[model samples]
Target chain A: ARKTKQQALETRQHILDVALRLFSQQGVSATSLAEIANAAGVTRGAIYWHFKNKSDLFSEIWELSESNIGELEIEYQAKFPDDPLSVLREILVHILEATVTEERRRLLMEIIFHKCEFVGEMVVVQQAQRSLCLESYDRIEQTLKHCINAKMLPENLLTRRAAILMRSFISGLMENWLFAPQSFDLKKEARAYVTILLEMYQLCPTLRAS
Target chain B: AMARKTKQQALETRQHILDVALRLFSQQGVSATSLAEIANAAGVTRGAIYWHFKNKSDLFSEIWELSESNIGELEIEYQAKFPDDPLSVLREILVHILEATVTEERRRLLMEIIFHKCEFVGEMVVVQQAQRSLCLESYDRIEQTLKHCINAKMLPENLLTRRAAILMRSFISGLMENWLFAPQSFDLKKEARAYVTILLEMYQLCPTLRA
Candidate 1:
């Protein structure tokens, strides 16, 4: 019975992985649950049993990507034992490198940014996901706090706004690059771009608290 | 007389469709929305939509072009008013967009639609072109402003105007997207000035952004 249950779980994950591929390629509205099931080599019944609908599938796929945030955190702790600023920069570089290397994750972002609509039920799901991701802002703020402790940034730095700025810089790089893949090489230029943002912390006078 | 009346009513309906579609498209992604849904919500029929627009993409383009032209008008007005002080004009333009985005519901919705709701999937001819048109327009204007600032000796003459322009656009563009995504994360209106300050000060003082 445990063997059967494990196989069922595997089948469920297969459905999600397949949906992410189709959703990324064709878009959320363009791809249907039936299509996902067909591509996954599962029956319509199997899909229905696993996910409530396409949006449910989408929410699940988002969860799969969200799981990577933990890995990023792990990388920071392992690579940089004492310097939070260095770890912060390392995590950002990891983001760009991950975006370049992780095809499904990049596809997930493509769907969220350009392909998916935040309407009706999807908006509810999106809002929940957003709030869940806000924890990342806290994580960024904590890192900035470390920078302040190290006296790397201004002693009076407002980690909140600083975090938001960091969020924008990182998200924007991904958006602009993903928006036009051929426009810039995100993987190759990730460090330089990250350097520019880090410099803003050290130089941008207005980022400090009055 | 009846034909003229019909034509006048048709024009009003056209605007009506545009208004409703913009609201709907802002709420929902373009691919997920249907003409029928728009007509039903808009108190019009399918025939009226067909008459006004050959298809959804046509309606989308027309709506985008209207907004773009408005920005173009503003761009012309700003440049003519500040020919000598390019950095001032540039700062004003950047600040204007952030402040305008915060206060203007329509502009906010438009950004949300363009950044989050719209997709560049299959058959993106109209969508892709609309983006490039706006991007190139901003790029040219921003680069020209940088050239002026360079010649004026505000920025070093050795400054790379094109790269500077790209950096500014990307920063502003990123700031806007993040603000809309999480409004409570930071005060866009209050912090917008600070964000712009960082951008200008970077090239003005920092060697990292230098030639």
Candidate 2:
């Protein structure tokens, strides 16, 4: 059964890999499970063995992409707890750079930014996914507070507003870049973008404590 | 000729098709809504829509253009009146945009369609290309304005206008995306000024943003 389970897991991964490409090439709503199976060269029964529905498969694709990012979080922070701000900056830059360099990350971003419709059943999926976004903001806020305690940022910096700014900046930068990759070089400019954001946190009085 | 007599009627028909398309696109998602459905709802034939637009993407592009024209009402006067103070003009334009986005139903629907409803796939890739060109054009306009602000001594001489314009564009687009995705999540109208103010300050003070 151990070998059988391994084969099952491998088959599942194959389906996800094929689904990601299909979803990116043709919007998620337009791509069906049968297509994903055929692309993966798997049977429909194999797909049902893993996923409940198309929505479930779509959700799994996002989780798979996000899981890799989350895996690195602990590794980086443990390596540099002394400088939380540096660790945080590295995290932000890594995401941008990875989106440019890593094909999977880039495709996932393209899928999110351009290829998925947040309508119909996906609307519910979006609402459920909202907490993940809020969770991200909360983490950024906590990290900003650490930066302030470490004297890396201004004492009066409004971490909440700063967190919001960072969140939006990253998403916006990704959306703009993915829309027109030739317009800007995200790989070369990722560090500069994060550095400018840190400077805003340090100097922008509007984001100061009330 | 009959052409002159029906010119006004043709224009009315085109406007009617556009209005119906916007409604369907926003509610039904652009990928799922078809030209046939739009025609049926608008009380027109598919041929009539084809006469006005080449395809669904073309119709989508025109609707976006309509929204762009509507949103530019404030910026035209701001540029004309404050030729010297590009900084203030920029701030005013940003605030007006966010405020209008919050209050105007038509603007809100268009943003929803662009940001969420429409999937940039297949033939709709044309819309994405158009948006890229428009994004570049807006960046050029903003960069020139930043240069003007620097010349007027409102911004630092070392300010990198190209990078500043890019940052500004990203920030504003991000703010709109976050808010439009969940408008009830925050108060955009009340905070538009503070957000734009924070951005303007970043342009002035952020060392990394400077040359």
Candidate 3:
């Protein structure tokens, strides 16, 4: 049966979505292209047609995820260009809330921790992952710079460095949340945590002194 | 006379070998550190190591036991001082744990060991063993204490033994990670104390707190 271009694209998207979900639920090491094909109700050949191999499929999924996230940033900026602090808070809350949900968080964690080992011989895959991370970080830095330039934040060394520091702090907090949930109430304590950060940011004289 | 002198020297050598092995194992991973390197570090021959322990695994087990004993001693002291208050004891124990890993050199060594344990063993066997042993001992000692507090309506009704165990394990693991990574940013001892106090206050104030 011949399929139109639109149908083929939809089929490909379905395959990618199923593959991503399966990979997240099970570790990437445990998932296979055949399994993806079966789960997607497509032939194995369809996957190969879309992707060169499992690695290619995984790489594409990663790239697609990054692009999707990038689109969110663009839309956010366009929607609320003048409200940098609100945008920052919204972005962080979104990340934290998204991660607290089991499916998304676990999948992200598995990919992050196992990506290097998964594509052992593929230098391009490794480089691509690194590039995506750096690109994401660059976007975040751009947002911070925009806020600073607009006088929404302080324009000083400490204020300039706050973005990286806040990112690290949040990353560390998230790692703890993942590794041990019984110890801290991530959702409940998030307000207090963010309050501490915002207070620090405001204390910087060159930044917003509120 | 010769036999006695040799026995004394052997005992000293054994202690020195264990000390060097602990330092090496903490700095580099247990797998990465060779027996030969440990022998050299301790200023002894491979033959002398073999005399003290059968294999690397045996030495590692002994180090694990020794470390646990040191930890157990601290736990005992805390319980002795604050026999009725598990929360206070737990807070003090956290302070000791933070002190062990606060310095850069110590933090790096402890982190290396922890990372290796997590990677190789798939669980923190060494830490878990120590925690379980101390927690069990404390549980027994505080059973009556807990019962009295419950009966008198001093402690919350939701303060189950499992809850205590979970809180202890999670807080210790979380604080260890924080102290190791960013000691300057996190005063773990203070934070732990604050957390315990808050928990107590919440327990007293909120009727449906556990809910």
Candidate 4:
């Protein structure tokens, strides 16, 4: 066994992966750092050396999501440069579909949306969530702008307001499903949901920049 | 202080306990705020808290219902005002909810606690069930209203009322929850009408939303 920086990095990754599962299962406030260390088969000192605290760990997970979205934007935008709305649709549908198809993604979202409280030091986590949310809105708004430039959306579209609407609509779909998985088939309905959203951008008069 | 005085005092104590509980639940998480804590904060005994409310879930449900009674009033008034236009009534109801969520302090506190503060696993699952039933009722009302809109030609006859209802509910709930969490992101009061308009448009114009 090599006692190197590579081993240290792997140890940190293992702790993060283990902690997310515990957070999702036990709720953030109820899950202790000791529990995370124990589950990851590491010592408490190792956990602290890698991260400051639970909030720090949670913030890193959010940052991971941020980078993932950034990468998705680049990937999808390149695939559909002339049709950025397709890019938006693809990303939105991917989130919804992956939420059900991928266990870890679903669990991570469940922890953020339902299994955590935003009290005390965890208040910082809430701010991170907000930043991630606003970042998502900015990305969606940028895509809408691209669509308008490409003539995929109307010229006078209220991109700012439309961006907020689209973000809220997509989140609403996810939140509803996350809250009650039995309520709707999020994976099956993802495309239709995206369709309704895109069509609104195409047809809704009130979304015009007036 | 006789029997009448005691009854009045009891009612006052109950309302006071609810106020304290709401504040505590909003500041801390719901699971962290216990009935004993509520009693201590309200300066009442644990027995008094249990006497008025069965448990935390029941107390929380009552707090929610207190806010919902406002919706009940809006429903009755709107029906009387526009007997032929359920579409208008539905729109008004949703917009009003957003407005209340913005202007009313208690409503904002209640929504924040439910959306952000409480983890719906464990014993708090009962609170989640109460919320679910409320959402179902809201969806039912929206569905009925859409049917009336179809009859009036305000909505297309081919529209999927159930899906439309769910979309309407989900969007508004999402809007409120998201806005409540990060209010600086957007002006909910300013965008409330436009957002609602977009949702209605989705149902009215989107072919994919049709049956």
Q: For candidate 1, lDDT tens digit of each residue in B1-211?
A: 6775475348787887877887888876777788888888778778767777777877877777777787768877888998878787777778878877788876787787778777667665557756766676676777777878888888877766665666777788788987787677678998777778778877676555666
What TM-score against the true fold does each predicted structure earn?
0.90, 0.93, 0.50, 0.92
Write one digit per residue (lDDT tens) for candidate 4, span B82-192: 888877787788888897788887888898987888887776677777777777777787788899889999998999988888788778988998888898899999888
Docking tier of model 4: it is medium
Pairs of residues at least 3 apart in sequence or in different chains that clash in candidate 1: none
DockQ of 4: 0.67
Q: Rank the candidate models, highest lDDT first.
A: 2, 4, 1, 3
Tell me, by TM-score, which candidate is best.
2
Fnat per model, in the order shown:
0.62, 0.72, 0.00, 0.68
Assess the local accuracy of residue A166 in candidate 4 as a C-alpha lDDT between 0 and 100.
77
Question: What shift in Å separates residue B185 of candidate 4 from its native position after superposition?
Answer: 1.9
The runs of at least 3 residues in candidate 4 whose Cα sits more than 4 Å from the true structure, single-residue gaps closed, are: A1-7, B1-9
Candidate with the greatest DockQ versus the true structure:
2
For candidate 2, lDDT tens digit of each residue in A1-210?
A: 643753487888888888888988888888988888888887777777788777788787787777887877787889888999889888889999998999788887888888888888888778867878888878888988988899988999988778788888998999889988988898999999999998888888899967
TM-score of chain B of 1: 0.87
Error (Å) of candidate 1 at residue A165 is 0.9
Task: Write the number of the candidate with greater lDDT, choosing between 1 and 3.
Answer: 1
* Candidate 2: residue B110 Cα off by (Å): 1.3
Q: Model 1, range A1-210, lDDT digits (tens) per residue? A: 643643497888888888878877777777888899899887777677777778888887787777877777777778877777888888888887777779877888777777777776687777887787588888778889888998877888878878887878777778776776665577887887788778878877777788
- Single out the weakest 10-residue window by summed lDDT for candidate 4 chain A: A1-10
